[PDB]
Amino acid sequence: AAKDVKFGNDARVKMLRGVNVLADAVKVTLGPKGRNVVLDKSFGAPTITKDGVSVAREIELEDKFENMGAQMVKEVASKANDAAGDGTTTATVLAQAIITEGLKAVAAGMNPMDLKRGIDKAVTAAVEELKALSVPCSDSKAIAQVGTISANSDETVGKLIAEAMDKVGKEGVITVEDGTGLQDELDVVEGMQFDRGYLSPYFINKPETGAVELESPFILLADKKISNIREMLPVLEAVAKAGKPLLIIAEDVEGEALATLVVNTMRGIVKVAAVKAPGFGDRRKAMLQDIATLTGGTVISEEIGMELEKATLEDLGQAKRVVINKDTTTIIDGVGEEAAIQGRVAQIRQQIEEATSDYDREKLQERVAKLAGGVAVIKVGAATEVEMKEKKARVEDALHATRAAVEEGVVAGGGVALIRVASKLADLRGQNEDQNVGIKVALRAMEAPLRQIVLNCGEEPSVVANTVKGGDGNYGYNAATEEYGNMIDMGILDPTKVTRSALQYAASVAGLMITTECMVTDLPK
Amino acid sequence: AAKDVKFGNDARVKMLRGVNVLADAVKVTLGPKGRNVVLDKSFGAPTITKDGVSVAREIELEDKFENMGAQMVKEVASKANDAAGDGTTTATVLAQAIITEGLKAVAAGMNPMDLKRGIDKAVTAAVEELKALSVPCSDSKAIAQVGTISANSDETVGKLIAEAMDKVGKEGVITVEDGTGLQDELDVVEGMQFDRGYLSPYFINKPETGAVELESPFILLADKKISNIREMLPVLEAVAKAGKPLLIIAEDVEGEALATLVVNTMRGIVKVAAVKAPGFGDRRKAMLQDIATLTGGTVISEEIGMELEKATLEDLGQAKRVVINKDTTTIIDGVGEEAAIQGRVAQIRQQIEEATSDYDREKLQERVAKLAGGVAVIKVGAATEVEMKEKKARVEDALHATRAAVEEGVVAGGGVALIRVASKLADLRGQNEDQNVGIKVALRAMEAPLRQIVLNCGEEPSVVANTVKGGDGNYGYNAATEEYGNMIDMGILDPTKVTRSALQYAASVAGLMITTECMVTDLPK
Amino acid sequence: VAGGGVALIRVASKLADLRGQNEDQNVGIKVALRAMEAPLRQIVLNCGEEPSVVANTVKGGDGNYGYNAATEEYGNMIDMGILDPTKVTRSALQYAASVAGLMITTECMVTDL
Ligand SMILES: Nc1ncnc2c1ncn2[C@@H]1O[C@H](COP(=O)(O)OP(=O)(O)O)[C@@H](O)[C@H]1O
Ligand SMILES: Nc1ncnc2c1ncn2[C@@H]1O[C@H](COP(=O)(O)OP(=O)(O)O)[C@@H](O)[C@H]1O
Ligand SMILES: Nc1ncnc2c1ncn2[C@@H]1O[C@H](COP(=O)(O)OP(=O)(O)O)[C@@H](O)[C@H]1O
Ligand code: BEF
Ligand code: BEF
Ligand SMILES: [K+]
Ligand SMILES: [K+]
Ligand SMILES: [Mg+2]
Numbered sequence A, B: 001a002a003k004d005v006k007f008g009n010d011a012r013v014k015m016l017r018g019v020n021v022l023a024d025a026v027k028v029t030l031g032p033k034g035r036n037v038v039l040d041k042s043f044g045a046p047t048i049t050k051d052g053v054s055v056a057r058e059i060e061l062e063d064k065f066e067n068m069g070a071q072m073v074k075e076v077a078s079k080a081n082d083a084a085g086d087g088t089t090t091a092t093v094l095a096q097a098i099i100t101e102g103l104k105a106v107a108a109g110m111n112p113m114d115l116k117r118g119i120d121k122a123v124t125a126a127v128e129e130l131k132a133l134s135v136p137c138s139d140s141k142a143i144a145q146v147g148t149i150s151a152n153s154d155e156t157v158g159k160l161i162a163e164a165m166d167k168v169g170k171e172g173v174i175t176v177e178d179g180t181g182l183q184d185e186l187d188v189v190e191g192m193q194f195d196r197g198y199l200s201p202y203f204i205n206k207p208e209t210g211a212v213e214l215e216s217p218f219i220l221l222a223d224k225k226i227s228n229i230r231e232m233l234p235v236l237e238a239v240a241k242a243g244k245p246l247l248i249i250a251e252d253v254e255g256e257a258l259a260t261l262v263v264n265t266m267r268g269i270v271k272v273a274a275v276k277a278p279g280f281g282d283r284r285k286a287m288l289q290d291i292a293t294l295t296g297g298t299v300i301s302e303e304i305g306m307e308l309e310k311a312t313l314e315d316l317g318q319a320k321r322v323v324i325n326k327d328t329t330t331i332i333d334g335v336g337e338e339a340a341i342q343g344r345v346a347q348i349r350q351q352i353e354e355a356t357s358d359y360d361r362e363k364l365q366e367r368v369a370k371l372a373g374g375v376a377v378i379k380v381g382a383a384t385e386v387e388m389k390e391k392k393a394r395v396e397d398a399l400h401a402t403r404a405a406v407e408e409g410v411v412a413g414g415g416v417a418l419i420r421v422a423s424k425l426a427d428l429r430g431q432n433e434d435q436n437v438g439i440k441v442a443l444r445a446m447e448a449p450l451r452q453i454v455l456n457c458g459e460e461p462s463v464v465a466n467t468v469k470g471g472d473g474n475y476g477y478n479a480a481t482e483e484y485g486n487m488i489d490m491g492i493l494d495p496t497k498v499t500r501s502a503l504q505y506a507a508s509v510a511g512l513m514i515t516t517e518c519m520v521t522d523l524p525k
Numbered sequence C: 001v002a003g004g005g006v007a008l009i010r011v012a013s014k015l016a017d018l019r020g021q022n023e024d025q026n027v028g029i030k031v032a033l034r035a036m037e038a039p040l041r042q043i044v045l046n047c048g049e050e051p052s053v054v055a056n057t058v059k060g061g062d063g064n065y066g067y068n069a070a071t072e073e074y075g076n077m078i079d080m081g082i083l084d085p086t087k088v089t090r091s092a093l094q095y096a097a098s099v100a101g102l103m104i105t106t107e108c109m110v111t112d113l
């Protein structure tokens, strides 16, 4: 197709307009006084959301150049969401800040390459500063706060996340699903997380988020490589009569089979997923039988006297719910054989005492811990499915923030952290003036998230900004109460991870963009 | 379909406009202050790229005739990138200048074909002059420089390429792939790789490793479909007396032979790896004999007159270690003597001179390359996908640059080489005054790269040009720091190949383009 | 003063050191200094000489060294007698800057249909 081509300022102006039209839509959601965006997902009812990445992802624009700028920044939000839960709106605001300031500086005629280079220098130093600044978060209390604040000041959500991580342990798997009724509920259930994802992205169905959730999935527990579903087509027949999805957990699935699934599942009877049998060798057979007990199934191989041709409804495992993602699968609540489950537990422990060689102790300890943790599930309470999505999303942000916190701990939230580091870096300089002004752009931009958060209040942004700067250490602004104080004591806790991630990815993309003189895009008509 | 046809200046003017549009898109990227172009990739995030040939490919214009101009200059860009990875932008700028000056000379009424001949004559002399200027590049430091300069002054990248080329020697294969961390990382697949592996899991003695590794393995090089253990009996005796494992590089992983060798592996009597022979037919045979001599063995098959019983300890190959994978084998320090290995490479070089078909040419080069050393892999570290692509492209350019440098030497970069050769050629003349004009056209265009590099800096191009021309030898302009000096001592090194290649292709396409009198294209409907 | 735009470009080179309180004032200063070269380059371009080379050569010269557009020779403007009154240069510059400042600060325009 014939390409339109633009140069210099025309390109830059087009870009910047597209950026703004995305950012402004994202950034309205920021902080405690942010407010919701309505996304008209064609399928049905619109979804009201406060998640910035959910907003950004939808934004697509009519002008090919403005759209190009928008799609570019879109990347930032998705990256941040892929590192961490929170931080997608902060990362977008930072990116748009750098871009704006940087383009201003380029209009002064300064070299964009050196501008980019200077931004990168600042970010590196900034990241280092945050690291040192971060106070480890380990007190359940602090964990709660982190939760709460990521939940948009939702006390109850913080409570539940803290209690769940207490009950399963901080390393334990926790999951969130549409609850049955009005109230939030928490319970711990017999389930398993093993580190294998979908064997193909074509199994991604219901969620957009690169995952699949299946209700009452059947589990074919076969330590074999599936060449063609012919080997179990009467099982898929059976499963048709079920009308309930089948999870293959097998050593491999050939693309022949995968393509046959593509031919028959969504285009036909029932959705089917395949996952790699976890671990390897004797371990993988071990885990498959560990899951058979967890699900009341059997291991399907001729070493057992079983065959893919023969596995009954009852030779396959039964789970109530399974989640699969790019990298991991969580059997949420296997039917299983509870007494046998516990007996297995005791058995595996005995091998810890027998298989006392260091790495055997390790694997066995892992497996017992895995089985003993089970899984927690958080049931989101809502009157209406609209609020279901909204609250559920708010919870998952809390969840991902808490784990991130537990990893790296917390820094003074509300954007104080970024300002603080900014102030520390004021003496940082580059090789040349272009890099020096690039550094100043970076530092400057770090202000943006505070100002934005204030602005959403409709408080007077520059005033708050200036005072906070005047303050020192943890001194910040509480935007839910319009009071200066020790942010920590208030519990406005940001996990260093999210802030670090947001800054890196924001600068990363931003620095590139400024350097553009020319854009090649298809003529609209 | 009904063709539109235009003549004379209605043709050339339109054609030139197309050329200009493409060039201007490309040009911006030239040099250290050259700056990125955003190429829309409708399915995905746009590609931010500084690779000029990447730019060229996308350019395509609505106006049929302007399109023609673009399409033909596009061709020189691409051809440049085929000959050598770097130099695509230089070739474009050159082509633009020649075309521009040629069309101008034609407007004077010069015989176009004489111009073309004059251009061609000048170009030939310039190639010879570059050959004369070129100083061998050999020291690692120069390699680093060339890599740096081609990397867009990315010192780290130059360092990494140079040390990688050292670790695997000049002739080693080096490849670049998407890393995961922020930090770039270099790995090497040690030893004699060959690209065939096991086709069952039961060979794996190291299940946590997920591959088969053997220490002090003997190597039964039976390039055949092995049948039975019976033929191995005396071999197995010698093996068991040595107490060493055995690598079965069969033709194909087949036969009861291997099945019972797996049985012996499970009994711990002898541990055995088995893999396909690489390639087919005579080239398959050749690889097995190359493995053999390198391993200090000899191809143990009846098709070369030796039944498997007949193998001495000079026919069985050995290594300190071997590893075999799903798809690949590597042999670590085969016991074959270094003199035998070198000699074997000599016969392979004789075979290379005998080979007249890519089926054997590329494969023979791969044999000698792997015999010279392992394969290095450069993992490009970047925060963001956009960086992934952008950084990767620069790395790849650096890689192909260094290669070219090693093979043909280097000249003073920043376009000084072209300037110098142009000045040396000022005495050249043709058969007739039309031809002489064409020569001067060529010599004048040689300035264009230098000027364009300067212009991107926003510096007076002709001022810099004149001062450079006034200087002698490697005296030039450093566009990264805006001061003149010995270009070589600064380390701004260009591979002669890329300079030479870029010039030739530029000249060829341009010299044709100026002789256009009529263009025929479908009407715009 | 050296008439041939020499004076302006001379002073422009002299003041390159000057800098302001912030990037906005710095770009403003740079804009002013760059413009002052414009007379010389225009005069030359009318000749169809290369403005860049002549400008640089004048800048690299000293005092009244300048480009005689009538003859294309370089020389001392005074010896040739290419004399601008000082007032003319000064007034030209100041008034030019005045309008520019007016225009930059201009926020609204009112006219009939
Ligand atoms: N009560 C509060 N006072 C000040 N800042 C707050 C408060 N509650 C939340 N914030 C800040 O708002 C941001 C969280 O809002 P959110 O929309 O989740 O941003 P993101 O999507 O980037 O996580 C964090 O910077 C957090 O510190
Ligand atoms: N520091 C420098 N000073 C001057 N010229 C440079 C410098 N670094 C690189 N160059 C020049 O930049 C030119 C263009 O390089 P590049 O951007 O890779 O375009 P191409 O695709 O033609 O190689 C090269 O001829 C190189 O000599
Ligand atoms: N021979 C010459 N070479 C170069 N510059 C000249 C020459 N003669 C006059 N000038 C300069 O040309 C400039 C502009 O000329 P002109 O446009 O006629 O005057 P003004 O711009 O004041 O109306 C004057 O500043 C003058 O000194
Ligand atoms: F704005 Be986010 F996703 F916390
Ligand atoms: F623009 Be290139 F390939 F250096
Ligand atoms: K938000
Ligand atoms: K380039
Ligand atoms: Mg948040």
Ligand SMILES: [Mg+2]
Pocket: B086, B087, B149, B150, B151, B397
């Ligand atoms: Mg290059």
